[model samples]
Target chain A: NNRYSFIGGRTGQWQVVKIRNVLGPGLQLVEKVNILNGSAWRLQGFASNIRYAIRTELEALQAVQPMLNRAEAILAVLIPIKKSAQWWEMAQDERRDIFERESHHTAVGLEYLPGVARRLLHCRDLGEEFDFLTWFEFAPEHSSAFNELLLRMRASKEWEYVEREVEVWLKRL
Target chain B: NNRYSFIGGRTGQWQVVKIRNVLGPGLQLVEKVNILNGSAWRLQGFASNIRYAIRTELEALQAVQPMLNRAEAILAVLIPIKKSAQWWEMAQDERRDIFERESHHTAVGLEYLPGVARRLLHCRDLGEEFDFLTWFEFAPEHSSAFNELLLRMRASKEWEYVEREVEVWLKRL
Candidate 1:
C-alpha cells in the first residue's frame, strides 16, 4: 500500500522536524513527528498517475530522477497544498496546459537532477484539508538547490492556483 | 511611537518575504510583507523593559549588541511567541530564575554579537494570539550564526514554555 501518515505529537526514529508555516494554517508543533508507512490514519492518501506529464517528459524524469529513501538523503520536507475553486473548475487538458506549457513545472524541477527526490500523494477525493501532499528528500548539501526549486516553482503560473500551502521540514536521526 | 505592523499582502519597498510556520497556526502568505513603523494596525504592541534582566546583564547586553536597521543588515526576521499558562502562573522571580539562571537565554544570545541585532515587543496584556513579537536583523554572512543562535535558544530551558511561535523571513528591497 502506498500510504503514509505524518503523526505530529511525539518522537520516533526521525528527529522532531521543525514545522514552519509557509502558507495557510500551521500544524501543531510537537516534540517529534512520526512518519509511518501504511498506517491507519484518518487522513490517508494514495499515489496517483503523473496527470500533467506527457510520454516524453515522463520518460525523461524516470531516467534522471532518483527514488525516495536514498541512503544519504536524510533531510525531508512535506508540503501540503490546496488549489483554488477556479483551478478545480478547469478541465484536465486546460490544467495540463497551464502546468506544463505555461509554467514549465516539470522542466524546472528536472534542472535539480537526482539531488532532490520527490513524490506526490493525492487526497482531494478523500475530502481532506489539502488536495495534494508532496514529499521531498535530499542530502544536507543539496538543501540550497531544493530551496531554489521551491522558489522557482512558487513563482510559476502553476502555483497561482495554489490557494493554501504549508511546508514541514524534517531530518532523520 | 514604537509601533510596527507586518502587513502581508503585496509589495512595497521591501521584497516580498517568505513566511514559514515554525509552530502553531500559520498566517497567510502574500506577495510581500510591508513593515510600517507607525501603521495604525489593530494588532499593536509596545516595547517593554527587560523584565528578567538584572543590572549587570542589562548593561552587558547594551554594551555588545548593535541597533536594528543597519545599512548592511537588509535581512530581517519577525518571530511571534506565546507562552504557556504554566509559565505565566509562576511568580515573577520564579520565571526569572528559569529564564536566566536555568536557560541563560540572554547570555546565549550575547555570543552572536554585533552581527544580529534584535528588539522585542510585548502584547500579552493586549490579549493577542502571541505574547511577544521579536524582530531581528542581520547581514547575509551572519545568517548561519543567526540560525545557530536560534538552535541554541530553542534547545534551552526557556523555550520549553513556548506554546506558539512563527518565524517570518524577509529582505529589504
Candidate 2:
C-alpha cells in the first residue's frame, strides 16, 4: 500500500512550517512548485477518462504482521512528459489495459506491497521537468526486490509512454 | 552552463489540463506544493543571511564542447528539511564556512565540470518530502565520476544538516 501527505491542488506561496520537531521521521515538502523563485507548472488535465482499476488492497493491521517501517533508504523518481501525441492517441480502454493487468502494474506492485510504500505526483499539468514524480520508501533488506520490481515494470508496455525518468537515492541523516 | 525554467508561486486551483504536447525543457517544476491532498506548505522566508557560497561555476560552452548533451541517463534528487533547526541556528559566517572554500563544495563539483549538469530546487519553504531537489544530467561514462562527486560532498560538513534525501534514476525513451 502507498501512503503520503500530498498538499497541493491550487497554487500559492506555499511554505513548509514545522510546528513541532521535524528532525524525527516522515516526509514534508512540495513535489513540483519551486518555493524559492515564484515559478509554477501550468498543465491541462488528462484528456481521456483513463481509469486505474487494479491496485493493491491494504492489509488489515491486526490480522497481518506489519511490514518494515524503519526505512533505511528513500528513492524519489521524476518522470517528465513524453511523446504526448502517441500516448493520448490511444483510447481510454486501451491505455487502461496496458496499465492494469497487461502491464502488470498492480500485480508487480502487490509483491512489494507494505514493504515498499509510495506516492505519485502529477507534474504534466504543472509544466515540470517530467510528468510524474514517484516516491518510494523501504528497508535496506528489500532493496533487491525493489530493483526487480522496477526492472520488471520498466520492461512493461506502459513504460513506452514514459519520456524522461530519473532516480535520486538517499539515506536519512 | 546551467539552464532551467521554474514554474509556480501563487496559490489557487492548480490543475494540469493537457497531456500530449509536453513543451521544450531543461528543467521545469514547482519546488514545494503538497500533492497527496490539497493543503499547501506554508512558511515564512529565511531569517538570517544564510546564503550558499559553495557551488560550481559555469564553464564556457563551445570552449569545452559540452561534456555530454547526448545524455545516457538522468538523476534527480530530493533533499527535504535536513537539520533546518540546526541549519538556521548557525550564523551566516558559520554556514558560509561550511558551504564554500572550507567545505570544498565548489572544488569537488568542479572536477566533474561540463559533463555533469545540475539544478538546485529549494523546497524548505514549500513543505514537501525533501528540502531541495537537486537535478543532474550526464552521459553513461560520467556515472562513476558523478558518484564520486556525491560521495565526496556527502561527507562534507554541509551535509550534516541533511535529514532526508532520495534519488530517482531514469533513461531517455
Candidate 3:
C-alpha cells in the first residue's frame, strides 16, 4: 500500500459510513498520510515502510452468532495517530516480533472473528478527522467478549502510541 | 430555558439540523454561549451572571452571506465533558476573559454571523453518548472559511477543556 491517499474532489466534508449491505460489500484497505501535516505521494518518501504485514485464517466464532442482530448496537471508533516517530524508529523485525508477542493483534482477532465484524480505514492521508477510523459490530450477548477483545488490544504494546480514541454507538433502526 | 431540559423519547439518536428559511426550511437557534465543559444550569449554579454569558450584536459580514445556503452543508461536532472540577475553580471572570481576549470565541463567530448558524445541545444529564453536541450550517462556498474558523477556535483556550471533539458532516438528501 502506498503511504498517501487523496479524496480528490470538491465534496463537502463527508463521513464514509460503512454499512453492512449486499449492494456494496467487501474489504477496502487504503494507506493513509497526514494531509494536514503532509501529502501522501511524498509522505512515504519521508518516512515510510510496511514493517509488519501478516495474514491468518479466520475461523468463525460461532459463539456470537445468536447475538448478532439483537440488542448489540454498532460501535465505531476513530483512533488518531500519536508518537509516529517512536513507532517507526525500531527495526521492522523488532516491530513484527512485538506484533506477535506483545500486541497479539492477529491472535486476539481470530478468537472473536465472525462474531465481531471489523473494518479499518486508514485516514492518515485522507485529511479526515482521525488517522484510523475503525468500526465494530456485535450483539449484546457478545458485548463482553467484544469489550474484552478491545480492552486487551488497547493495553498491548502497539496501543502505546495511540493518543486519541473516540467511540460512538448507533442502534439499528 | 429550564435548568434541566429533556428532549427524550426518541427511538434513535438524532441531530436537530437547522437551515435558514430563505435557503431551506428547518431548525433554528435555541441560544448560543458555546459552553466548554459544563451546562449553563450547573455552570451558573457554581458561577453566575454576565460573567458566564455574553451576547454581541454584529453587522453582518457580507463576505460569507453570498455563499450562504449555496451547497447548504451541515457540520456537527460532538464534544465530551472533561475535568469539570478544575475548570469551575478559576473565577468565572477568568474564563470569560480568556473567552474574549485569548480564544476570541465571540469575535470569530461574529465574523461569519448568522451565515454560519449554530445550536448547542446539553447532553450530559441525558445519559447520552456525548456531553455537548454543537451543530453548524453553512453554504458550500464557505467551506474553506469554516475550516479556518474551526482551526482557529480549536487553538483557543476554550477548547483546552474539550477532551474529545469529533466532527461529522451530513448533507440533507
Candidate 4:
C-alpha cells in the first residue's frame, strides 16, 4: 500500500500545515524521515498550477493512515516537522547536506510534488468560509506506485508544521 | 555537462504538450543542443527569489549560434517522451516504468511542490496567461556558471534554453 506524505517531508509545506490543523492535538507525529517509495512528480509549477508531489511511504509512515479512508477528501492534514532538532544539532554542513539529500522516494524515482492547488493553498475547514471546497485536479492515482521515499527531518520532533507563524486576528466590528 | 531525462528518455503528458507548443509553427527554436558548465552552478531558477535572475547563457549560446538565443527565457517544458509516438495509446500498466518526474529545483534544491494556494498545481511561466512557467527563481550571481554550463552543453549538443526570448521579453514584459 502506498502512503504519500501530505506534510513534513521534503516537498510538504501546505501538507504539513493542513495536516497539523486537521489532526490537531490528537495527532501523533515524529521527525519525518526521508524514505523513497517511488511515484513522485509534478504537472507544472511556478505559475497558476504550481505543484510538488511524491509517492507515499505507507510502509514507513503512520501519518498518512488517516488518508486511507478519505483519499478524496480535502480536509486531511499532514503536519510538517518544521525543523528536526536532532538533525539541526548535528553539524552545519551536515544539516545542509541532509536537507539536500533526496528523500528516499525522490532519490529512487518517485515524483512527490503535490498538485498545483494543493501546494499553494490549504483548506482550514471546508464549508466553513469559502464557497468552494478542495480539488485534486492532477493528483496521482492510487495505482501510481507512489510509495514513500526519504522523510524530511524537521528541526523538531514536535509537529510544528508552520515554521513562522504570523497571525493578526482582528475582531469584526 | 549534465543532461537529465524524464526517466529513461521518455516524455510524459506534461512535457509532450510543452515541447509541442514551443516547437509550434513560426517560432524558431534552438533544438537538440545546449551548453553545460560543470564544477559550479548559477543561481538561476524559480525559488528563493523570482526576480534576481542572471542571464549567463546569453553570450555563449549566442556564440554557438543565433538559434541558441531562442532557447533562453524558455522553460524546459518537459512532460514525458517515451519511444512510442502515440504514448497515450499505451496500456495503463506501462505507466509505471517511466514518465514520473519531480517538481523540485535543480539549482538551489528547493522543492516547488508546495505552493501556498494549490498543491495540485505545477508549471511556472515568465508571463501571465502562460499555463506553466519554469519553477525557476533567479540569483544574479550564478549567471556565468549557468552560462558556462550552457556552453558545455552546447559542446555536447543537448537540451534547450531561450536567452533571446528573455532579451525580447526581459525588458518589454
Candidate 5:
C-alpha cells in the first residue's frame, strides 16, 4: 500500500473505528516528533526493501483542519483486519508473527513527525463499543502525517473506488 | 445512596452494552463507566443521605487475561448502588445522569478476570461486540460470599442457575 489509500471520502472519525478492529484498543496519543524518528526499515513489507520509504504522506487530513500545533503526546491508531480477510486467515502462530510485524509499521506512522518522544507502546486485536472495530497507533508526527495523507487523498479526486480506508485518531499517549 | 443497599444475588457483569440503547455511539468509556456504575446505585434505590463505601482498581498487562491475579491490577471494592430495569430505561439525560452519578460506585466482577477484562477496557460503543455478554469478577476472599449470596437468590436463578459456572471461571481467575 503506497501513501495512497482508497477511502470513500467518508474516512472521518468513524474510519478510526475500523482500524481498531485489526489493532487492539490500547491505542491512544503520543508525541508528534516521536513518529518521525522511528526507522521505517523495521516495518514488514518495507523492511525488506528500502526498509521504509516516506509512505510519502497520508491523504486524509493534511492541513489537519485548525492544524493542531505539535506538542508532547503518544497516540494509538486502529487497523481493521478481518481473519478471513487475507492477512488474518493464516495460522494462529503466523497470525501472531504478522501481528508483531505490523507494530513496526504503526511505529513508523507515529515516528513520521519524529520529535523528542517519551516511550512506545502496542496492542493487538481490540474492541469498540458495538462492532468489532479495531486499530493500532503512532506518535504525534505520524498522526500528523496520516492527517496529511488523508487530506491529500480527499483532494486527489481519485477516491471514487477505494475498497478500504485509512483513518487516524489522537490522544495523550 | 446508602451502603448495603444494592446488595443482590446475581450481579453478573453488566455486559457493557446496556447504555447503547441510551447514550448512542458518541459514548466514551468514562460515560459507560458512569452509566454502569450508576445503574448499580439508582436501580437499587439506596437510602438518601447515606454515604456509600467503595473500592477501585486499574491495571495494564503485557498479556491480558480475565482474572485479576492473572494480570496486574489495582483494586477498590467499596460502595455499590442498585437500580431496577424501569429506572434504567428512563429518558436519555435522566439515565445519563444516573450513569454519570453511579459511575462512582464500588465494583467487583467479570472485569477482574482477564478474558472479560480485555472487553471492558475503555469501551467505544461503535458496534455490538460489547453487547450480549454477561460477565463478572470476584476476589478469592469474596468467593464464599458470592456462593452464599447466589444460593439465597434461587428466586432469580434463571441466569446459569448453578454456581459452578462462576466457580469455574473464578477458579481460572
Candidate 6:
C-alpha cells in the first residue's frame, strides 16, 4: 500500500543503524538512513504485498497492529533478506506450507504484533541484492519483545530458506 | 591471491562513483569508496580466485595484462554481479562452455589486455548477495576501449545468465 526508500548516507532524519552482528554478508554501515515516501530513490522496488497471508490472517493482523510513525514508536529496524535459489525453486503452496504451517511464522508474529509494528517490501522481481526489505517500528519499552520476536522467527523453518539477511537498527529523530 | 574490501561511506581515499546507469536494481551511491588492502572490514569475503581459465589462457592473460596500481591506471571500476538461479544450476563444465565457447568471454577481454587490468573475486561460497565482485583498472586513454570491451561482454551469451550487476567507477587518490 506504500512505497519507501531507505537511503544510507550522510543525510537523513533517522540515526544510522550500527552493524552489531550479521547473519550473512551484510550491508555496509552508514551514518544516516533517509526514509523517503514515494519514488524519490533511484533504486526502485521498495514495494511488495503480503502474498502468503490469507484473508482471515490479514483481517486479524489489521485489527491489532499499530500504524507506523506513532509518537511512541520511535525505534525502528530494517532487515534486508535474500533466500537461496533452492528455496525459490519450490512451488508456492510448498513455500506456504513451510512458512506458516510448519514454521508457525504467522503465529509467532501474532504474539508480538501490537508491540512491534512491521512491514515487508519485496525486491526479487526488481532483481535487487535482497528479496525482501522488512521494516519494524516499536516503542523503546517494547524493544526486548521485538528482539525476542526476531529470535523466534530466525529459528523457524522458513528461516532455513534465507540465504542472506542484514539487520539495521535505526532511531527516528 | 589477494583480498580487498570496497566500503562505501564518508571515509575513503577514492572518489565515490556516480550511478550513470543501472542494469538492475543498483546499490546506493556513496560519497567515498574506501579500498582496504587487508581485513579491516566487518563485511567479509572480498576474496576469490580464477576457476574457469585454463593454464594456457592464464599464461596468455598474464603475459599481456598490466598490473593494478600502475601510475596511469588511476581510473577503476568495481562491478558486483549475481547470476540467475538457472545459471548456477548448470554444471561447472556447462558454465565454462557458455562462458568461453559460446560467449567468447576470454577472447573478447584479451583484445583490450594490457590497457585494462582486471581481477575477479568470487563470493558464492560465502553466501553473499553477489556471486562475484569484478575489479578493473585502466589508463585515461584506454577508457574508450574499456567501454567497448564492456559492450561486447554484455552482449555475450554469458551475460544472459546475470541477474544483477552494478558498475561503480572510482578515481584513485
Query: Which candidate wins on DockQ?
Result: 4
Candidate 1 chain A TM-score vs. reference chain A: 0.92
TM accuracy, model 6: 0.48
TM-score order, best first, reads: 6, 1, 2, 3, 4, 5
RMSD to the hidden true structure, all candidates: 23.9, 24.1, 22.8, 17.8, 19.9, 14.5
- Docking verdict class for candidate 2: incorrect
TM-score of 1: 0.48
Interface RMSD of each: 27.7, 22.9, 25.8, 15.8, 24.3, 16.6
Residue A148, model 3: lDDT of: 83
Q: Candidate 1 vs candidate 3: which has greater lDDT?
A: 1
After best superposition, candidate 5 residue B108: deviation in angstroms? 17
lDDT of 5 at B28: 24
| Candidate 1 chain A lDDT trough over 10 residues, lowest sum | A39-48
Q: Candidate 3's fnat? A: 0.00
Per-prediction DockQ: 0.01, 0.01, 0.01, 0.05, 0.01, 0.02
After aligning candidate 5 to the native by TM-score, how far in Å is the CA of A42 from where it should be? Answer: 36
Which ranges in model 4 have alpha carbons more than 4 Å from their true place?
A: A1-75, A78-96, A100-162, A165-173, B1-173
State candidate 3's TM-score: 0.32
- How many clashes in each candidate? 4, 68, 3, 131, 109, 0
Clashing residue pairs, candidate 1? A20-B21, A21-B20, A21-B21, A26-B26
- Candidate 4, residue B9: how far the Cα is off, in Å: 39
Off by over 4 Å in 5: A1-68, A71-96, A115-163, A166-173, B1-173
Off by over 4 Å in 1: A39-43, B1-173
What is the C-alpha lDDT profile of model 4 across A1-173, one tens digit per residue?
11121222333322322222232222223233222222132211121221122123322223323232233432322222223235323432233233334333223332433321122232211111211122221233421322132123223222233332211111111
Against the reference, the lDDT scores of all candidates come to: 0.76, 0.45, 0.44, 0.24, 0.28, 0.74
Model 3 ranges with Cα > 4 A deviation? A1-173, B1-51, B55-84, B125-129
